[PDB]
Structures are given as C-alpha cells and as structure tokens.
C-alpha cells in the first residue's frame, strides 16, 4: 500500500504550496548557520591565541567579532521561526481538510460495507491514522531539509579551509553518521516497542477483567493468575533485552564521538607543528565536519515517518475512494410526486453479505395497497425484519423486482424514500441529545407545537411532565436514566413526528405496559387510513386489530388471507390464536526496597556520567592551551599525545558507565513493573463483585490503570533518582571548577544558564518525538465519534447524516483554531532559544576579551569557563527532558497503593465464619428484597420468597429484566441481600464458606464465554483446586454427546481455542458449558437458558444428563421454552420481581392464571 508523494499532498490549496516553498527555503538557510558559526570561531580563537605576545588591539578585534556572532544569531532567529511556523501551518490546514472529508465519506456508505469495517477499529482509524498522517508531513520534512543543508555546508566549509584534515574526519564519518542514525531511531521508537512487549498479557487481562463474574463463578482464579504470570515474565525478558540493546547503542555513540576527538587532535598537531595549518583551521575543520556527519543521523527518523504517512494514507484515502451502490446522498436520484401508498414484491430473496453462504429469505411475492395494515405471524427464525430493512432500500433485493406505485426503487432517491417510510425497529436506541432534539430529528424544521401534539397523541406525555426542565431534560448515554417503556413510547413518538407516507413497526412494544399500548395502538389507528402501514410484532395485542394477517414459515409466505381466512385455513395463525385465547502520599520508594543493589551501582555510575562533562571541559581547554603557550616542538608533541590519550580514555569510561547505568536502572525498573502488575492483579481478583459493577471502576478504566500506571510508578522512583544525581554531578562540578578557575566570567554566565537549559530541553523535545495533544484533549470531537458509530443504528433509521457531519464540524472546528495559535507560539520559542545560543557565544567571548586584556585571566581559563558552564547547562537540559513527569507518576502511585490497600468484603480466600459438616440440599428465601446498589434509583426486586426440596426442579418463569437471573447473585453470594433472611438447609450463607458455597454447586451461566486455551483447559475449567483427572474428562464430553465433535477435531485433547472460542458453532459450544458443569457434579445446579441456541434432540440429552442426576441433587431451571417447564417440579411466576402464584403443574393449570398466558407463544 504505497500512496507515493503526489497523491499524499492532493488535498492542498495555493497558500499551502506557498507555505511549503518558503518553508524549505528558510529551512535550508537556518541550516547553514551552525557551520558558519564555526568558521567564525576558528579565526576568533586564532586571534585570542596569538594576541597577548609582544594586549594591544585585542578589544577592538573582539568588538568586531561580536557583530559576526550577533549577526548569525539574528539571522537564525528569523530563518528558524519561519521554518517552524510555516510547516506547522501547511500541515494544520491539510489535516483539517482531510479529517472533515474522511468523516463526510464515512457517512456515505452501503450498509453492507459496514460488515467489512468495524467499530473500535474505525475509531482507531479516524484518530490514530489521521494523526499519523499529520506526524510525518508536518515537521519531519522541515527537520529533514534543515539537516541536509547542515551536512552539505559542513563539507563545503571543511574543504574551503583545509582538506588534508577533513578527509580523515570524513573517512571515519560514515561510522558517526550510522551510529547517530541508530541512536535517533531508538529514541523515536521507544514507547511503541513497549506496548508491543505487553500485548499478549494485556489482552489476557481485558478478557478476564470483562468476564469477571464468570471466573468468579467457577474455581477459576489461580488459573487466570498463573496464566497472566507466564506472559508477564515474557514481557520482562523481552523488556530487559531491549534495555540492554538500547544502552549498548547509546554508549557506543559516545565512545565513537570521543575517539573521534582523539584522532582529530592527534593528527591536527602533526599538521600544526609541521607548519601548514594553525589551531584555528583545525578547530574549524574538525567541528564543522564532525557536526555535519552527526546531524545526518537526525534526518533518518524523518525519512521513516514519511514511509509511515504515505502508508496510512492508503487506507484513509480508500474510504474516500469508493461509492456505495445505493448512494445515501445522491442528488441525481429520481423523486416521485403522486406518491400513493403501494407495496410491490415479487420473488424476493436476500442474504446478509456477512454470511452469503446462507440465503435466509427464499421467496416472497407480495402486493399490498394503500392503508393496508399487514401483520406477519411466524416464529423467530422466519426473517421479517430482513424484509423490513430491504424495503427501505437499505439493501438491494437479490431476486425479483420491488416497486412502490408503478415505478421501482432501484433508480430513485433513497433519502426522500428512506424518509417517507418511517420505521421503528426491534430494539430502538436513544441518543444523548436534548429530548426535543431526539424528536426534532423528524426534521430540521419542526415547531414545538408539533412536538407537543405528537407527544400527546402517542400519550407519552405524563413522564414528560414529571421530569425536571420539561423541555431541557438532559439524557445521558444511550438513554438509560429513564425507563424502557417510555423509551419505546418515544421511539414511537419519533417515527410519528417523522410524519411518513408509510408506517413500519417492528415490535415497538418491547417492554411496555398494557394501557399505554392500547392508547398507542389507537393513536396509530388514527393515522392508518391514508398511509399504508405494516407491523412486525409477536405481541398479538397490537396484531389482532389490523386488516391483514399474513403468515411466514421458513422465510416464505405460506398462509395467506385475512383474519377469518386464517381461522378457516388451519395454518399457523389459527394455532396461535387458539392457544393464545485524590489525597496522594509519598511512601512509594518502599515498593522497591528489595532492589537496593541495583540502585547503589546506579547512583555510582550516574555520578560518574555527570562528572564526565567537566572532565572534558578541562581536557579540551588544556589541549588548546598547549598551542597557545610558547614551548618547544617536543613539549607540544608530548602534551598533544598525552591529551589525545586522555580523550580516548574518557571515551571508554563513558561507554562502560552508560552501559551500566542504563542496564541497571532498566532492570530494576522492569522488575518493579512486573511485580506491581502481578500483585495489583492478584488484588483485583479477590475483590468483590460490587466493586466491579461500580461505575468509574470499569473494564476500560481498570485495564488503563493496570497497563500504564504500573509503568508510571517505575518511572517516578528510578528516573527521579538518576536524573537528580546525574545533573548535580554535571553542573555542580561545572560551576565549582568555574569559580576556582574564573572569578568574574562565571558570574556573567550564570545569567544565561537558565536559558541554555531551556534551549536544550526544547530542542530535544522535538527530535525525541513531540506528539499532538488533540490525540488526548480532542477526545474524539468530544464524543461525537463513538456515538455516531456505536449508535449507528438509529442513523440506520433516517438519513440524519448532515445533522451529524455538521455537529462534527462544530465540535472539531473549535480546537483547530487553537492549533493554529499553538503553531505560532511553538515557532517563536524554538527560534528564540537557539538564537540565545549564538548570542551566548558573542557575549561570553567579548567579556572574555575584556578580562584577558587586563590580565585577570587567560584564554585557557575562558575556554574552560565557557565550555564547562555553557555546555553543562545545555546537557542539563538534554538529560532532563528524558525524565518522566513527577506530578503524574506520584498521583499514579497513589492509585496503585489505593488498590493494593483496598480490603474487599467477604474475602473469597477466607475460611472465616462457619464450616458445617452435614448438608441436606434445602434452599429457603424469606422476604428477600434486593436492588442492585449500582442502581440506587430503581429497586429491582421487591421481596420475593421460595421453598425448595431435594431434586426439586424449580421452574422460575418471568420476563426479561424482572427476576429470572437475579438469584444467581443472591445465592452464590455476590451481592448481599440487604433485606430478608435466607435459609440454605436452614444454614445462613452469611456465615457459610464462600469458596465452598461455589465449591459445592455449579451452574450453566446465561451465556458461556470461553478462553485462550485448549478444550482440556476449557471444559476442565469446570472444576479447579483439583487436578484434571481425565477419566472424568473423557465422560463429561460423553454424557452430553459432545464427545462426538471433539474427537473429530485435530488434536483431540489439544486443539487450540483462541479468544472466546471463535472457531466452532453454537451446537458444540453451548454443549460445553453443560459438559463444563458435568465434571462439576453440582449438588445444586442453577441452570438459566440451556435451550437458547441448540437442536431439539440434543436438548433431550442435556436434559437427561441433567435428568439422570435431577434426582438427589437440587435442580432449578429458569428458561423460556416449555420443554423444561412442564417436566419441572414446581413453578414460580415472575412479573417485575413479585412472587404471585406457586405450585404443581396440575395445580397452577386448574386455575386460569398468568402461566396460562406464558404458555401461549408457540405451543400447540
């Protein structure tokens, strides 16, 4: 995927071609202003040296060479501000354009093309990939052009002044260039490698973090913790190897620089003494060529970024490329005028291209006229809602030709049409806009009186009165502060204000009441004369009162006719109607006390790394003083050789000490990180379930914490220590040496040291890897990104795209302008500090000349004070910019100690309480009231009760969200029942043993999630704290006939299972959770919906393997299908949590009650 170069800059205007051209010009010209600085420095020192030999006319010549230095300073000020500001502007504009256009093209797309795309990945796209395009083309091309200029100027100066030396410097410069390349590259790709190192274990944490209730429910904690440990240790080995190699490469860069000084001066003295050169030409040639070779390395990261951009641009410019078959926008679409209600289908088929192997609808030939209200009767399995979407031109039907009133849909406007067929779907969703905005999505132009009229028609207006700020009532995400019945009433209200030409309902009475349903159906019937309508509902209540009732079976229209026709027809509708009638503390060093030896060695080697800058100051300003003095050629030669060798030795000790400080602080940091992750996880797990379900303590929150804040705390301890001591060695010694050698210049230079430090930090913060803040502040246009994609479905309701493109435009055009202001600021700062470097030369050497011509100090002493304090301050900067922050890392450690301190209620590992010897198998609940403390505003269970006997297969029947699965959390002790008193065998579970209460019993959850293991480590997960004895494992697959599928799979007991077992089909996996609980041999088996997705003959075998032990072990089945309810022992009906009637199947059926109605779905 290569976008080359021309395609990459396609989204540009005139002004930006202009910005780029003036940019590279001012970058080439800010480039060549270091080598000219060394060309002046050469002759300046060549005049200081020879001056004071019979201080006449020194201060004059220095008043001249103050103007060369200050001139180049005030030329770089400008060239650098121009380069930075102008390239950040080219990029700013170009990325804004591409971002808005990407979002615009992501709302034009065939619904099928969202089968290919995803949700989380697509948000990764529209933030990470676009910021990655920005990253290259913004400034890396500036920095790249500037460093190429400094290289070529380095060579031109070094060949103008003297070649015989620049050839040697150059002939070892390939190794300098290469080592600079590797150093800089390692620096840019440091954070990215780390995440790659953590990937697996991180993904293993998320899975377990999400499904925590399950891995509680079995014995599975120790397994999940060892599982983690293994991949953690792999992250540690990869980590410390990376630390070793990072430091080797850095240490060898320094060794090579210093050995390069050694060669240059050992050769330069041969030349100087021979007569040819002087000390000025050698300083010039050497510094200019040495700086040029080193700079090229800085250019290399810029080259890699361009490869990254013109790669990611492939996929982004892809969504920009293709036009969906059914153009959602499409202004060329035909528009009808005399649109009378008609509906025409003929031999209609379709498959959801997410599965094109199965053709689910295998024929439909339908003709419906105006006002004709049609219902569709048939099981879940026929495919009504498929037709529903197919009508709205949300797809192309494959066979036949669908039309409406003469002309066909395939050639006419989809916005207009998708409109005039107003729909409500099965599970409509609620937006986090203002309530009146949700509604007004009927039209850009709507009046408040219309909203009032429609909400009094739908009769969803009482709760409209009840809420605060009757027309300002803020809903949150998804609309879950209020009820679900009101939620369906207002989805109704929306497809009502949409005022369509046809009204298509898909079960708009999901969890709604009766009287509101009747008023809603009457208000519907108010608009069913001139506007065609069709209802897709299982609730027969709003089904009987329509004109036509048609019958699906196997996705085909089998039974045709009106009500009476289906009565006399003996189809499916006949049987149906027949049976229906914070405070942060510092205690954090103590988390890493075990590693005192690494720290001792580390502080020692950091002291020495710090001191290695003043040692160079002295040695350098002495190998210069040698050529200033008046000596023999023998003394000049011997001292050149001695100081060359001291240059080599400083290099070697630099190598070894960097390698050690790096390796050692690295290894202590990795070890702290690993034990902190493992221990914070072992304390996450044992915590309760209330702590887990609590909002603000979620799966995203917790994985971010456990995958970052551990590494943050690592940063605080070791980094703070290494940087403080290295800097104190460096600059403390620079300034003390400086006061001793010089008594007047160091005082003037202390007034510049702060600015030099700041200059070093700003330069390194750039080359290191300056990132954008929007990637954290911008948040995703706020929350318009996720919402548009996540809740993409009610946008699969109407068009209402523009009203999202434009909300994007606002919430994204605000920060944009703040980014331009930030470009101007960063430009001025990055120029002003560099300019301060050049004016540092000028001020320090002019004052040095005034001191030297009054015999208060020498040229050795001024070259010492200069080099030591100035480049000591610069190196204080360059090193303090690697230091991780200390506000964040301290708050982070507060969070970690917070968790590692938290004491979960009723410790899962605890044997404290009551440990009984005799067990019977009774369960009794008395006035047990409960509400989930996570919902303090809705009380969910209002004090039910039960009585259980041995082997008593207790039927629990109710609705969805009203007390079928809430005893999973009362009996297995997740949420303590606040009101009531429970009797399991008459024994209070509040004193019982918890890892035994779940040890004794085992259930089949509402859904099984499985894991990253083998079926030998997935079923066998059914029991733990006991070895897997396979003669039990062989038969757990056998009792449920699931031994068949497994032995056919390769690696019969060792076939790989990926994440959540995404390989097999349902019929083999839902069999496994049962096979899971078959090795469990639970004395009480709380089964919930073991007949959701299974064949009817293996439902027999799971029920018999349940049955062949349904004696003697207490049983309880909670499900919809009556295949398990009539063969259950007792029944207890549920309606919003209240227990009304109980009893035997022959007793609750002799009375016509509610269970008479709960039989009436499909039995007959």
């Amino acid at each position, epitope marked *: 995927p290569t976008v080359s170069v021309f395609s990459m800059f396609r989204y540009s205007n005139w002004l930006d071609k202009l910005y780029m051209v003036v940019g590279t010009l001012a970058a080439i010209i800010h480039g060549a202003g270091l080598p000219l600085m060394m060309l002046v420095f050469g002759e300046m020192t060549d005049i200081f040296a020879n001056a004071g030999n019979l201080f006449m006319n020194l201060e004059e010549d220095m008043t001249r060479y103050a103007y060369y230095y200050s001139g180049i300073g005030a030329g770089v000020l400008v060239a650098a501000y121009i380069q930075v500001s102008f390239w950040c502007l080219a990029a700013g504009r170009q990325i804004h354009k591409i971002r808005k256009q990407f979002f615009h093209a992501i709302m034009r797309q065939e619904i099928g093309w969202f089968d290919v795309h995803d949700v989380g990945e697509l948000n990764t796209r529209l933030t990470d990939d676009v910021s990655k395009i920005n990253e290259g083309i913004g400034d890396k091309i500036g920095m790249f052009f500037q460093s190429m200029a400094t290289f070529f100027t380095g060579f031109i100066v070094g060949f103008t002044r003297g070649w015989k030396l620049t050839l040697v410097i150059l002939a070892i410069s390939p190794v300098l260039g290469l080592s600079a390349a590797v150093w800089a590259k390692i620096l840019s790709s440091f954070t990215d490698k780390e995440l790659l190192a953590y990937a697996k274990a991180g993904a293993v944490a998320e899975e377990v973090l999400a499904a925590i209730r399950t891995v509680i429910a079995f014995g599975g904690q120790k397994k999940e913790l060892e599982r983690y440990n293994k991949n953690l240790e792999e992250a540690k080995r990869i980590g410390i190897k990376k630390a070793i190699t990072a430091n080797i490469s850095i240490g060898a860069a320094f060794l090579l620089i210093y050995a390069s000084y050694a060669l240059a001066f050992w050769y330069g003295t041969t030349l100087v003494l*021979s007569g040819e050169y002087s000390i000025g030409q050698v300083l010039t040639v050497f510094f200019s060529v040495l700086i040029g070779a080193f700079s090229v390395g800085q250019a290399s990261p810029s080259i890699e970024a361009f490869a990254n951009a013109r790669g990611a641009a492939y996929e982004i410019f892809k969504i920009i490329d293709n036009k969906p078959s059914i153009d959602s926008y499409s202004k060329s679409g035909h528009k009808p005028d005399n649109i009378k209600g008609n509906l025409e289908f003929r031999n209609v088929h379709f498959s959801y291209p997410s599965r094109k192997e199965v053709k689910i609808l295998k024929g439909l030939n339908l003709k419906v006229q105006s006002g004709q209200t049609v219902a569709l009767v048939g099981n879940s399995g026929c495919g009504k809602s498929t037709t529903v979407q197919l009508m709205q031109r949300l797809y192309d039907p494959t066979e036949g030709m669908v039309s409406v009133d003469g002309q066909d849909i395939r050639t006419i406007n989809v916005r207009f049409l998708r409109e005039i067929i107003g729909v409500v779907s099965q599970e409509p969703v609620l937006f986090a806009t203002t309530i009146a905005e949700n509604i007004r999505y009927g039209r850009e132009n709507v009046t408040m009186d219309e909203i009032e009229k429609a909400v009094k028609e739908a009769n969803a207006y009482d709760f409209i009165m009840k809420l605060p700020h009757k027309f300002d009532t803020l809903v949150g995400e998804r609309g879950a502060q209020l009820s679900g019945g009101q939620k369906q009433r207002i989805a109704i209200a929306r497809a009502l204000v949409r005022n369509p030409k046809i009204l298509l309902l898909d079960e708009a009475t999901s969890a709604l009441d009766t009287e509101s349903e009747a008023v809603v159906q009457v208000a519907l019937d108010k608009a069913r004369k001139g506007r065609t309508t069709i209802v897709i509902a299982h609730r027969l209540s709003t089904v009987r009162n329509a004109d036509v009732i048609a019958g699906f079976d196997d996705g085909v229209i089998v039974e045709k006719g009106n009500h009476d026709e289906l009565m006399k027809e003996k189809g499916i509708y006949f049987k149906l109607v027949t049976m229906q009638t914070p405070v942060s503390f510092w205690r954090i060093m103590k988390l890493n006390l075990t590693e005192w030896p690494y720290f001792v060695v580390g502080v020692f080697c950091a002291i020495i790394n710090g001191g290695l800058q003043p040692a160079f100051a002295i040695i350098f300003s002495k190998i210069i003083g040698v050529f200033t*003095r008046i000596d*023999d050629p023998e*003394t000049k030669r011997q001292n050149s050789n001695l100081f060359s060798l001291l240059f080599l030795a400083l290099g070697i000790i630099s190598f070894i000490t960097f390698f050690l400080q790096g390796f050692t602080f690295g290894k202590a940091g990795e070890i702290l990180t690993k034990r902190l992750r493992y221990m914070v996880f072992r304390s996450m797990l044992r915590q309760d379930v209330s702590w887990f379900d609590d909002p603000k303590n979620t799966t995203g929150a917790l994985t971010t914490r456990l995958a970052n804040d551990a590494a943050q705390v690592k940063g605080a301890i070791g980094s703070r220590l290494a940087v403080i001591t290295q800097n104190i060695a460096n600059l403390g010694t620079g300034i003390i040496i400086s006061f001793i050698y010089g008594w007047q210049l160091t005082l003037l230079l202390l007034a510049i040291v702060p600015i030099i430090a700041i200059a070093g930090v700003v330069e390194m913060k750039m080359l290191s890897g300056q990132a954008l803040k929007d990637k954290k502040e911008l948040e995703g246009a706020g929350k318009i990104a996720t919402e548009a994609i996540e809740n993409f479905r009610t946008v699969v309701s109407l068009t209402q795209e523009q009203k999202f493109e434009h909300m994007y435009a606002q919430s994204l055009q605000v920060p944009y302008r703040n980014s331009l202001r930030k470009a101007h600021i960063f430009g001025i700062t990055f120029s002003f500090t560099q300019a301060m470097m050049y004016f540092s030369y000028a001020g320090c050497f002019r004052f040095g000349a005034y001191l030297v011509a009054h015999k208060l100090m020498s040229f050795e002493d001024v070259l010492l004070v200069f080099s030591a304090v100035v480049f000591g301050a610069m190196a204080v900067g360059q090193v303090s910019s690697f230091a991780p922050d200390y506000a964040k890392a301290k708050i982070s450690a507060a969070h970690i100690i917070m968790i590692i301190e938290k004491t979960p209620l009723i410790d899962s590992y605890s044997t404290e309480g009551l440990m009984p010897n005799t067990l019977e198998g009774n369960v009794t609940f008395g006035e047990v009231v409960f509400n989930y403390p996570t919902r303090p505003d809705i009380p969910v269970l209002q004090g039910l009760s039960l009585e259980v006997k041995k082997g008593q297969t207790l039927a629990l029947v109710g609705s969805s969200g009203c007390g079928k699965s809430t005893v999973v959390q009362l009996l297995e002790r997740f949420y303590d029942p606040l009101a009531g008193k429970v009797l399991l065998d008459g024994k209070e579970i509040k004193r019982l043993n918890v890892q035994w209460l779940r040890a004794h019993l085992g259930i089949v959850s509402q859904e099984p999630i499985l894991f990253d293991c083998s079926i030998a480590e997935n079923i066998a997960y059914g029991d733990n704290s006991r070895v897997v004895s396979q003669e039990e494992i062989v038969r757990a697959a056998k009792e449920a006939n699931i031994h068949a599928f497994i032995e056919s799979l390769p690696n019969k007991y060792s076939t790989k299972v990926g994440d959540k077992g995404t390989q097999l089909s349902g019929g083999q996996k839902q069999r496994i959770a049962i096979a899971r609980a078959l090795v469990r041999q639970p004395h009480i088996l709380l089964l919930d919906e073991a007949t959701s997705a299974l064949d009817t003959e293996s439902e027999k075998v799971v029920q018999e393997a349940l049955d062949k032990a349904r004696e003697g072990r207490t049983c309880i089945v909670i499900a919809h299908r009556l295949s398990t309810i009539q063969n259950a022992d007792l029944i207890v009906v549920f309606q919003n949590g209240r227990v009304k009637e109980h009893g035997t199947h022959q007793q609750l059926l002799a009375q016509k009650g509610i269970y008479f109605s709960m039989v009436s779905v499909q039995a007959g």
Partner: antibody
Amino acid sequence: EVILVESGGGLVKPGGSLKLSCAASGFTFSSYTMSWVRQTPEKRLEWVATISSGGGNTYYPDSVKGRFTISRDNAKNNLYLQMSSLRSEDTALYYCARYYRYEAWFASWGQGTLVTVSA
Amino acid sequence: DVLMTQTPVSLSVSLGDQASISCRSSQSIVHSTGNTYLEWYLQKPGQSPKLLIYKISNRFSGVPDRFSGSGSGTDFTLKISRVEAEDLGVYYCFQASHAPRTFGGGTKLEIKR
C-alpha cells in the same frame, strides 16, 4: 625589555650542592620555556637543562642527568637549578635563557653567574 | 650523536669586506616535523651571546641587513657582507633538531688595521 638576573654561585667542594636562581621580570613569566646554558673556561658553550612552561616537562642532556634538578615558581617569577654531586669539571659560567615564539631556542640570555668547584 | 664542526676557526676580515663562516653537522639535522633548526648565536667580548639567525634563513628582530644565513642539507654558512666595526666576537652554530642539543665549536672574528 626583558631582564633576567641570577644569583647563587661561589665556591663548592666536590660532591657539594647548591642552588642557582634566576629572577626574571618583564615578560609574563608563566608561559615561556626556560633553559640554563653553561660556558666553560675555554669559552665553549654547552647545554645544561630546560623546563617547559607547565613545569612538568624537563629535559637534561645525557651526561649530567640525575644530579641537576631544574624547576620554577610561576607565582614569584623564578627559575632555580639545584646541583649536587658536582665534579671538577663544573667550574663554569651559567646563564639563563628564554624562548623565541618562532622556534629560536635561546633568545634572551640573562647575565652570567659563575660557579667554581675545587678542594 | 650529532657533532658540529665549524670550518674557518680564526678569521682575518678587513673592515668593509665580506666574510663567510661554515658549520658542518654530521647526520643531516632535520627534525621529524620537517623543519631544521639551526641558530647562529653571536657573542661579543665581555658580553653574553645574542641571537642572529634562526631556522636557517630568518633574522632575529633587531639585526642589521647584512647577516645572511644560507643552508643546504648538512652544510650551513653565514655571510656577513660589508663588515662593520662592532661585528667582532665569536660565532656559534647551535642545532636543536636532535636529542642532545649541541652548541658546536666557536669561530673568532678579527678586524685588521
């Protein structure tokens, strides 16, 4: 101009020891190489010792090594040569010396001081 | 090691003429660095020598025009043309390019009258 003037001198029995000085003024003493030079009774010069500006680089001819030790004080501008175990061939006249910047070896001879060793 | 002969020992010049002095070193005095150092110190009577010519052809600042040193390989001469009356004394050719820095012999200059 520069003046170098020395003292010391006189008469010392064989195997003796003494210390010739050389106070130099006028030329910022802490930079130049210095030398001693010796002129025997036949008016025939000879080199004796040299010390570099730093002070940590002294060169003596092959013969008179070990028993003569040259050194300097840069703070007071003085150059001392300390002689011991002198023979009967040490009767001489010793001069200081300076060092021309363009490689001219002895360029500013101070006045002489003479040293006679006899029983 | 390096020893320096000086060919004319005693010289009989007449005031107003040209005189020549020669200094032969065995061994081709030439340093490692590439120069040859060979001064021509001149001492008067009752005086401590003064420099006259350094690095074979140069003249120490403050010398007349007529002292010309010329040096080929291992033989070096000094020519005084138009001999004045304050140019009497003894000449010394001191070489410093090798390990014991010798001072050579000594040639005397007498003006006839």
